Design a protein around this ligand. Sequence first.
Ligand code: HEM
Ligand code: HEM
Ligand SMILES: Cc1cc(N)nc2cc(-c3ccc(OCC4CCC4)c(CN)c3)ccc12
Ligand SMILES: Cc1cc(N)nc2cc(-c3ccc(OCC4CCC4)c(CN)c3)ccc12
Ligand SMILES: C[C@H](O)[C@H](O)[C@H]1CNc2nc(N)[nH]c(=O)c2N1
Ligand SMILES: C[C@H](O)[C@H](O)[C@H]1CNc2nc(N)[nH]c(=O)c2N1
Ligand SMILES: [Zn+2]
Lengths: 410, 411
Amino acid sequence: RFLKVKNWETDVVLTDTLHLKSTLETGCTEHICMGSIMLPDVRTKDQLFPLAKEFLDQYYSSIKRFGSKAHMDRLEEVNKEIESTSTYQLKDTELIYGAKHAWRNASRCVGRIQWSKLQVFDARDCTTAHGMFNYICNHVKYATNKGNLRSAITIFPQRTDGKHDFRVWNSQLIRYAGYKQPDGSTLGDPANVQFTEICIQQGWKAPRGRFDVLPLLLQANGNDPELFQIPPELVLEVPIRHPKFDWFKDLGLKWYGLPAVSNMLLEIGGLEFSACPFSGWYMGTEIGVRDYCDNSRYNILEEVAKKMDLDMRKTSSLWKDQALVEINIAVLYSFQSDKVTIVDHHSATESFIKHMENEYRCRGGCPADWVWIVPPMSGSITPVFHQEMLNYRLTPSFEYQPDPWNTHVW
Amino acid sequence: RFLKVKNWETDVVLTDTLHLKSTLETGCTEHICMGSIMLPVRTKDQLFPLAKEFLDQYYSSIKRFGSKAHMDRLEEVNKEIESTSTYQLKDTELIYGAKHAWRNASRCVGRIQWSKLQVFDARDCTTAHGMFNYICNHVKYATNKGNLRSAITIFPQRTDGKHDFRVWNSQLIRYAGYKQPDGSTLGDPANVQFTEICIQQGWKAPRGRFDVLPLLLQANGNDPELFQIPPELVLEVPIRHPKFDWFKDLGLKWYGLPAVSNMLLEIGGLEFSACPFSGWYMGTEIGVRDYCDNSRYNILEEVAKKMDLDMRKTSSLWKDQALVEINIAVLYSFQSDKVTIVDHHSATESFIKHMENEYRCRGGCPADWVWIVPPMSGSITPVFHQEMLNYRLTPSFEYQPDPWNTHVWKG
Ligand code: HEM
Ligand code: HEM
Ligand SMILES: Cc1cc(N)nc2cc(-c3ccc(OCC4CCC4)c(CN)c3)ccc12
Ligand SMILES: Cc1cc(N)nc2cc(-c3ccc(OCC4CCC4)c(CN)c3)ccc12
Ligand SMILES: C[C@H](O)[C@H](O)[C@H]1CNc2nc(N)[nH]c(=O)c2N1
Ligand SMILES: C[C@H](O)[C@H](O)[C@H]1CNc2nc(N)[nH]c(=O)c2N1
Ligand SMILES: [Zn+2]
């Protein structure tokens, strides 16, 4: 039960002992593997104290003060505060550590070599949706940094009794609207049709274009959410052109520079932060492969292949594959030309292998979800394809949570 | 207890009850998923329940469960076990078992074909020369002048584990690999260790880049013996590109018949350690893995050079561009020579239809996403978006150690 992982391209073998510290469950059993399943009332006083203890133990071990006066003192202080208030508050030092380690533990994230360079914005003093809007504009501007992107998270007040949740209703701070057409097709991003309508069916007036930046729908302290438009000068966008095909410009494609996931839940020492938007920078395939070429998304392969004059009669001409490469060359070329941070899938997966070897050496392992880490194109020519990975759940963590409109006591 | 899988591109939801008939373990637990791990002497004691379970499944499939034929067969197998410690399958049971091992192979994307399998019964074989003869006939039948036909040849089952039949080749047709004193490799690097064994056993190696390996065959636990497959039985395809005339000058070719020969077939608790099986190629097996793996022929650089791509920064995606061209060439060459092949778009779409059909008629279809998704252009194939459940059903194909690590040499 001191497990080994092999890289089959290089024969490097790493021994994982970190998994023995895993706490939550994977969804698999000895009889069935659920590795490809996408998604496999508050804490009571009894549940919360062990969770705090485990977190504080690892925090004080990380600062080389395990079993110290200050350590035992903090355990006592939090234990007293839980007994008293039925919750507790993290010191700023513990909050920053917990957020950095939530990212470090995110087994589906290929970008984790950067995990220790996260800018943490403490927004626990926030009380209103206007205040949330202010914190998010500041996040967006800080992270965008005129195209030299910097990783950041903004942490809003923690769940109390679940009636007073802070939530960002958008799935990302910056996404494009989706409108179902009269005839039956979809204009804009189909993934956002429901949210685009909860915006319209709540106040928003839509340009009804192909790339309309959605408004923010912000919920403070459990109240009804409020619409806010992000200042357009804070939303950095990149028009997509190709370094060889002059007609690529005519396709009319753009994308935004800042990937900022806003719908997840951050868990630190048993406390729950239901509103914790975080951002980094894009790996090129997220836009070029998934956003543009998924059939349930912008689905542009047909149109691009036609402009390339490829033989689309048979699938064995690999015209889809050929167009796919060109689309992704253009995405990287456009971001690079406009000096907006982006990473290609070869560079990012190579970095993740180096990160894995760092984590195995200095931590005893690194939880990793191969199904998500392997890029959605050219899988086996990236080094992570040949890398065995162990997947398990460590805390602090980012977790999924239900969409708030299915839950909101309106 | 029922289980749901969702296709996130179509929202089709399927319900799995077949996983309840799974017995063998996956390697995973509630606390760790080993879904990407490559790899995660039997007594009369455990054998009759394994036999009974198989025979119950067999007689159910033929709508004779509980019949007198069913009960007599159980009785007969039971008494054959206690008196001889093993038993023999009827021909009907062998064919059923082999087809169902393929049906149950969760890493196989080609399973829509599972019921069209030609089963060759080689259980009367006794010598390596006899094995060579059976294998040649399999190769000729399966190749069918380029119109490939799925087939499996089944040699005698394990008895005491000291008399195993084994094919020491990992596939019936493979190219040799030679390590040079300067550290480079000539031929297929995956086959260096096996090539060295063949040479040690007396094979005269041509020492070229595409030398078909000899067969190394072990009957009845004896030392293995070398045989050369008749060259006229080995169908090969020279690789050229439909637009790039310089591509032929890379000197590439491949063989048409993929025939895996190192796995173990388990049926009713019986173990067939020599059971070579063959189908036809999915293009990416050759064009992505065999040609472009860094540890294989590794032709990306020279192809990208001749294409004159920007090779100075990986963000030109020169590797991705060359990879598509190589895979176009593989498909074009096989089709032009009229040798059966399937592209990864067709094969993944067939597998989705197969999988849905299996959920309807069978209650499930065990599938290993990590292996089913093709190694290029993953998310533009429909299997990428398909949730899958992986579990172990018998009859099954299993891995077994390479024979040279376990064989006791007679000398
Ligand atoms: C800075 C560069 C980063 C890159 C290139 C990157 C890359 C990625 C990619 C490609 C995915 C798969 C996403 C998808 O397919 O939708 C992912 C998932 C994820 N990323 Fe990262 N990311 C970065 C930064 C961050 C940061 C700063 C955080 C949080 C502080 C984070 C947390 C996550 C999480 C939680 C997931 C899903 C993991 C899970 O459910 O286990 N990432 N990332
Ligand atoms: C007829 C066309 C077939 C195609 C296109 C096909 C395709 C494939 C592919 C692409 C793989 C992944 C292997 C790799 O990447 O190296 C695979 C695995 C496999 N195939 Fe098929 N195959 C076919 C027929 C067969 C037949 C006839 C059998 C046996 C009777 C078979 C049994 C298997 C098994 C046992 C595996 C490994 C599965 C596991 O460990 O669960 N296949 N196949
Ligand atoms: C900071 C960051 C940077 C980046 N470049 N990319 C990122 C991608 C995600 C991400 C997006 C969508 C996801 O999928 C959600 C659906 C699957 C179930 C609901 C997940 C999965 N956790 C993660 C999160 C953060 C990212
Ligand atoms: C009939 C057939 C046709 C085809 N087109 N392709 C086929 C591929 C395999 C196959 C190839 C390589 C494998 O990998 C070996 C590694 C696992 C341990 C070492 C496995 C393993 N399950 C199966 C087996 C049969 C195939
Ligand atoms: C069904 C399957 O789990 C689903 O398509 C997953 C596969 N791998 C993925 N990998 C990444 N990085 N992102 C995804 O959205 C998905 N989707
Ligand atoms: C580490 C990883 O499990 C290993 O590289 C697997 C990944 N998926 C694969 N899928 C197929 N079809 N064939 C393979 O050899 C592999 N190798
Ligand atoms: Zn698993």
